Design a protein around this ligand. Structure first.
Ligand SMILES: [Zn+2]
Length: 309
């Protein structure tokens, strides 16, 4: 009696093994193969954060935990998860084609990134739709942004509360909360991209929920292009913030990301850690959503909200 639907979970993509690093970054760098040194540096970082295999993994766990959860919290629809990545196979078009081939005709998609941006989300969505329109006999309703879904906000708030709870009294009274997301070229402002505002909004929601009156919005992981990127970068923000007020502890909430990937384990847990360690402040960075039940239910609700269920 159930209606079959495709669950197109989209993401970035992540190397599966060390030997993928090259083509992965080459894809990311639009056909520009990293120099031998970059390559060696990149392998080192991945080794430094615990290896690669666990990364691509999380996304797979996120898709399937959601597929099963959605299939048990309601009995009108039976979902079948499909992973569409951006920089590695299975690519978005690939997933779409598979669904079509499997006979899917009605699908709903979601990107594993809370905030909407013309650069990423709109693109993954427009690509998924043009693939379906190309094959025909397949429609897709795409979720644009879910950074504001209450259960998702609740997740970050609860983690932050525990982190502040864990602090000594003197740190609890002199800490700084740094909410962040992947940086993006400033040019997106040309199109009125809500990305920056959604981040600030995520930051206002979380701080307000955890009862934090001292916090700042920042960006990280910016790429390499002549044109300027969204800032200030978390490294400079921390140092500058310490410079003017002298916070004894910093809390990083990379709300933009949903798991333990490079951008967090290294760019946060190492780069920001280097700076807090230099200024003598304490480093804190709450557990990422990953495939945890609480997170899956939030995503599940977002999908059901998108369907009017
Ligand atoms: Zn990046």
């Amino acid at each position: 009696s159930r209606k079959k639907m495709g669950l197109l979970v989209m993401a970035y993509g992540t190397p599966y093994k060390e030997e993928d690093i090259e083509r992965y970054y080459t894809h990311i760098r639009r056909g520009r193969k990293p120099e031998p040194e970059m390559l060696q540096d990149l392998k080192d970082r991945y080794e430094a954060i615990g290896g690669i295999s666990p990364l691509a993994q999380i996304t797979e766990q996120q898709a399937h935990n959601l597929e099963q959860h959605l299939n048990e919290i309601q009995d009108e629809i039976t979902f079948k998860a499909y992973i569409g990545l951006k920089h590695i196979e299975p690519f978005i078009e690939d997933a779409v084609a598979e669904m079509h081939k499997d006979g899917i005709t009605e699908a709903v998609s979601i990107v594993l990134a809370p905030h909407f941006s013309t650069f990423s989300v709109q693109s993954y969505n427009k690509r998924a739709k043009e693939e379906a329109e190309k094959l025909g006999g397949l429609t897709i309703t795409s979720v644009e942004s879910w950074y504001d879904e209450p259960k998702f906000v609740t997740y970050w708030v609860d983690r932050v509360k525990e982190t502040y709870a864990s602090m000594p009294e003197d740190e609890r009274e002199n800490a700084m909360l740094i909410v962040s997301a992947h940086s993006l070229p400033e040019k997106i402002k040309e199109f009125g991209d809500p990305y920056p505002d959604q981040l600030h909004e995520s930051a206002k929601l979380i701080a307000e929920g955890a009862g934090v009156s001292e916090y700042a919005v920042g960006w990280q992981s910016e790429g390499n292009t002549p044109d300027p990127w969204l800032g200030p970068d978390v490294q400079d923000l921390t140092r500058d913030l310490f410079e003017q007020k002298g916070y004894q502890a910093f809390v990083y909430v990379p709300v933009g990301f949903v798991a333990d990937h490079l951008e967090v384990l290294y760019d946060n847990d190492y780069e920001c850690k280097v700076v807090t360690d230099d200024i003598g402040a304490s480093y804190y960075r709450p557990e990422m959503p990953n495939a945890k039940p609480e997170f899956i239910d939030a995503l599940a609700t977002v999908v059901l909200k998108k369907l009017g269920r």
